[PDB]
Each structure stands twice: as C-alpha cells, then as structure tokens.
Design brief:
alpha/beta, Serine Threonine Protein Phosphatase 5, Tetratricopeptide repeat, DNA Cyclobutane Dipyrimidine Photolyase, subunit A, domain 3, five-stranded parallel sheet, 22 helices, binds flavin-adenine dinucleotide, DNA-binding, DNA_photolyase_N
DNA sequence: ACAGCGGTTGCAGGT
DNA sequence: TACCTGCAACCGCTG
C-alpha cells in the first residue's frame, strides 16, 4: 500500500476539516489501497524556548491527547513525529511510500516559507499535495483580489468586500476508516513502538511551576462543549455588544473561544454558521462591529491585512504602521511585564494573564494602552512579546493587529482617547473584587482607594496590612502627567509621518 | 481638492 | 438609566 498523510499544524480538529476529510474519503473510496497517517510534527528543541509559556504548552498537550482520542474513534490515531519538517518529510515520504499530503493553509510568514519548502520537496518526490483554506471564513487572497489587489484597511470596507464572497460548506466529522489495519512500523517505530505517541505533560511542559489553574482545557471536545454552552442563551448571543462586556468580572463576560479558534480546535466557519442560525431566530439583535458575528469578522479583518504584510509584527518596514519613536526603559518594562507597576488595576490584569493565559479584550486594552501611548511610551513590539508568551490564544495576526490598534499605530487614530488605569475598571467593578483577587496584598483596602492606593495615609496603609514601597510597589509613573505629554508626542509623530506620506 | 463624515470599547462632570 | 457636553482634533473614505 501507499500512504495518505494529513499534516496537522493548526486545524487541530476533526470537524469541518476538508484537508483531513479528503484523506479519509480517498481511503474509503479505494479500500485496501492506502494507509492513513494523521500527523503532528513536534520540534523538541523549542520546548524550553521562552516565547511559549507553560500554560500554552499544557493547552497543546491536552489538544493533542483529545485529537488522538477522536481519531481513535475513526479507527485511526494521531502520530506525533518529533523533528523538523525539513528532515522529517524526506524520511517519511520515502519510508511510508507517501502518495498524497494534505494540510490547512496558514498566512504567517514562517509557515509560508516552511510550506513552500515542503511543496518543493513533494513535487521532487512525486508526492501530490492538496491544501485547503479553512482556518478563516474568508480567504485573504480572494478578499485582496476582490478589492483590486489591496487589503482593506477599514472594517466597513472589509465587510463590503466579504459580503460579495461565497462561504464554503461547513463539513461534519470524517467517516470511520474501513479495512484499515495499523500501518507497518517504520525504522523509528521499530526501535521504539511509542515513538509517535502523544506527548506527556512531563515531556511537553519543562517549567511546570509556571502552570496556573487549568481553567480552559485544550482540545476540540472542550471547544465544542464551550461553544454549545455559550450558544444556549440565544438572547445573550443575539444582543451581544463587545463594548458592554466587563474587563474585570471574575468570570469571563465573553465566550473565551479564542484559544480554541487560534489552535483550530473550533472551526470559525462552524461558529459563524451557528451564530447566523441564532440571529435569524432573534428579531432583536446587534450588528457588526459590536455583535458576536462582528468579532469573528474582526478576526477575518486582521488575517487579511496580515496576509499582505510579512512585517506585520514590527513597526519598521510595515506598510500599515505609524513610525513612532518609542523609548527603551528596561525597568518600566519589567514592572509592566510582572504586574508590579503600582497601578492595581493594571497589575491585577497582568497577574491574571500570567497565571491563567486569558484576559478579557478590554483588560488587554487597559494594559496595552498603559505600556505604549498611554503611560510608559514603550514599543508595542515589547507588549506583543509578553502576550505571545502568556496567552493561550497567541495569534500572530491578531496580536500584531490589536497591538497596533491600541498603540494608535494603525487602524485606530483617535489617540486623544486614553484609558485611565485608575478610572476604567471602576465602571464595572466599583468594589474592586478583581483587584482583591489578583493583587491580594491590597485586599483590605477600602474601595475608595484600592484603585489609587497612593492616596492612603501611612497609618491607613498599616491598618490595611500593606505598606506602599514594602508590600506593594510605589507607582512607577504618574498617569495624570505622562498621558498628556504622550498625547503631544503622538501628535508630533503623526505630523512627521504625514510629511513623509 | 479638500471639507465633512464615521470610526468595536476615553474621561470628567453634568443632567 | 443612559445619554449629554467639552476636551481638541487624528485617520481613511467619499464625492
Ligand atoms: C493588545 C491585544 C492583543 C491581542 N492578542 C490576541 C491574540 O493573540 N489572539 C487572539 O485570538 N486575540 C487577541 N486579541 C483580540 C481579543 O482581545 C481576543 O480575541 C478576545 O479577548 C478573545 O476572547 P473571547 O474568545 O471571549 O472573545 P469574544 O468576544 O467572545 O469573540 C469571539 C471570537 O472573535 C474573535 N475576536 C474577538 N475580538 C477580537 C479582536 N479584537 N480582534 C480579532 N479577533 C477578535 C476571537 O477569535 C474570539 O475568540 C488581542 C487584543 C488586544 C487588545
């Protein structure tokens, strides 16, 4: 027999996976002719690379285990092949006698050059390759082409384009494999029968002391359970307005589907389809940009602008990005990174992020504004790096785009609007329950100064069990001064950019 | 040409 | 409640 291979990278699901389904229907169309190998390639070198935190490793570990469990139900399994694609594919193309390889496409620069190299190797070896665009509802290439060769840079124009595009069929889970014995062992499997088994926690998480509570388990099964639980309250879904959801509710005010959508545990096209069905049923409903469907479209929007710019994740060489003379400040960056800025709202958020790997969108706004244009005047690239480490939903395009938005570098330009690290959280948490949870050293402070503890006398600090400078830091900057100076810096940078433009 | 419009998610003070 | 203003004036899109 010859081998059909599906290569999982994102798209870590069985549902709505045309690349995977193509392999399974091809096998059942010619029973006895093929072996099927669903694979994930794991480079064991990067397990101690600092840009992937322990919480995201755990999520991947859990996702891979779920994916194996689901493939087992189809008379298959997951093969987790350790190595780099450049060495792995030449070996397995030969040893498995591979006839066809499928995978879901990705727009990220690294994957573009990785996949081009894979396709070059395949054509040399006479392996067929079939790729599918299913990570996004709309194909960025088609959006850009429909918009005369340019990515739309405003949301309303983007919507106007995608309304003209067709949405492919959402697929179910593939068919069970018929007449599919286990493939014969290759050289690697002959030495170690467990060589391609799912990695353990010990194998994947090198820094387990960095793990926090497992609030958001990995995998497609959890993705679908979580979505279905979200979709149950159709009134909540239909009337959803992002701006009215709280950043500092102890329980998430939004769906927390982002990690599942990032990994492909949940199909964005399926989620889109389910929401459309609800909106048809609910006469009173919100519209984009603020609706739940609108949030999915924001994801589509950023994927499209990112697709057209390999430098999307930096300032220099990035066609969208305002050139702003951000400053280096190691100490302030470290304080922000570790939630020791001395603004309890900011610190609470940065601590929740590190511990749990998800923070609400407007919490992201608050800390990202603070780091960049609002207060510290540090580049959004530094914030991006920290988020990249700590977020379960770390997404190249989404992280870059939203960091440019919040820094008023691209897409958003009204830099006069500046979040207050003192006032913003009060609207939705006047008692400061969120701060009391994530900055417990301040948990006895009255609500009157818990957002602004510098207003407390020394005798009051002592009475509250937390003395500033000892038990919680002094504030690293004075918001009321620096944000006004930074508005002027922003205006000056915009002028310089206009002049070049 | 350039003025006017709308832009997911500002704050403070006011009704 | 949910909206109003002044603050000071940005960008891309439109005609
Ligand atoms: C500084 C900054 C960095 C960010 N980095 C990431 C990131 O790396 N990965 C990521 O997925 N999101 C990122 N976001 C966007 C957004 O905050 C998250 O997607 C959102 O908080 C996810 O929570 P949710 O699933 O409950 O969202 P919901 O409100 O329930 O929305 C559902 C889905 O829509 C999409 N979505 C929602 N908001 C946005 C948005 N503003 N931009 C693009 N897509 C959106 C997500 O896929 C999300 O899961 C970032 C935002 C900011 C301000």
């Amino acid at each position: 027999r010859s081998t059909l291979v599906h290569w999982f990278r994102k798209g870590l699901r069985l549902h709505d996976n045309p690349a995977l389904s193509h392999i399974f229907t091809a096998a059942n169309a010619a029973p006895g002719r093929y072996f099927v190998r669903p694979i994930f390639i794991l480079d064991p070198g990067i397990l101690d690379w600092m840009q992937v935190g322990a919480n995201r490793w755990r999520f991947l570990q859990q996702t891979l285990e779920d994916l194996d469990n689901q493939l087992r139900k189809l008379n298959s399994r997951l093969f987790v092949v350790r190595g780099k694609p450049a060495e792995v594919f030449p070996r397995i193309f030969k040893s498995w006698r591979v006839e066809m390889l499928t995978f879901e496409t990705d727009i990220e620069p690294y994957s573009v050059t990785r996949d081009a190299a894979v396709q070059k190797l395949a054509k040399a070896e006479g392996v067929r390759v079939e790729t599918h665009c299913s990570h996004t509802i709309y194909n960025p290439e088609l959006v850009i082409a429909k918009n005369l060769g340019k990515a739309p840079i405003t949301y309303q124009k983007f919507l106007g384009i995608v309304e003209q595009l067709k949405v492919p069929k959402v697929l179910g889970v593939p068919e069970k494999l018929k007449n599919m014995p286990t493939p014969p062992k290759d050289e690697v499997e002959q030495k170690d029968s467990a060589a391609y088994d799912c990695p353990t926690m010990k194998q994947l998480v090198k820094r387990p002391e960095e793990l926090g509570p497992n609030k958001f388990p990995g995998g497609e099964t959890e993705a679908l359970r979580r979505m279905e639980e979200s979709l149950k309250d159709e009134i909540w879904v239909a009337r959803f307005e992002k701006p009215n959801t709280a950043p500092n509710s102890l329980e998430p005010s939004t769906t927390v589907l982002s990690p599942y959508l990032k990994f492909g545990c949940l199909s964005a096209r399926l989620f889109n389809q389910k929401l459309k069905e609800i909106i048809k049923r609910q006469p009173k409903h919100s519209q984009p940009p603020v609706s739940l469907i609108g949030q999915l479209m924001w994801r589509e929007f950023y994927y499209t602008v990112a697709a057209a710019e390999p430098n999307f994740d930096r300032m220099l060489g990035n066609v969208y990005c305002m050139q702003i003379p951000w400053q280096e400040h190691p100490d302030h960056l470290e304080a922000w990174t570790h939630g020791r800025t001395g603004y309890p709202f900011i610190d609470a958020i940065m601590r929740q992020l590190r511990q749990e790997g998800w923070i609400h969108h407007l919490a992201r706004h608050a800390v990202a504004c603070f780091l960049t244009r609002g207060d510290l005047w540090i580049s959004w690239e530094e914030g991006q790096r920290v988020f990249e480490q700590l977020l379960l939903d770390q997404d190249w395009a989404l992280n870059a785009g939203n960091w440019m938005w919040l820094s008023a570098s691209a897409f958003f330009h009204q830099y006069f609007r500046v979040y207050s690290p003192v006032a913003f959280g009060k609207k939705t948490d006047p008692q400061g329950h969120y701060i009391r949870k994530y900055v417990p050293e301040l948990s006895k402070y009255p609500a009157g100064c818990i957002y602004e503890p510098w207003k407390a006398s020394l005798v009051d600090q002592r009475a509250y069990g937390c003395v500033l400078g000892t038990d919680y830091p002094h504030r690293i900057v004075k918001h009321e001064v620096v944000h006004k100076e930074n508005i002027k810096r922003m205006g000056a940078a915009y002028k310089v950019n206009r002049e070049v433009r």
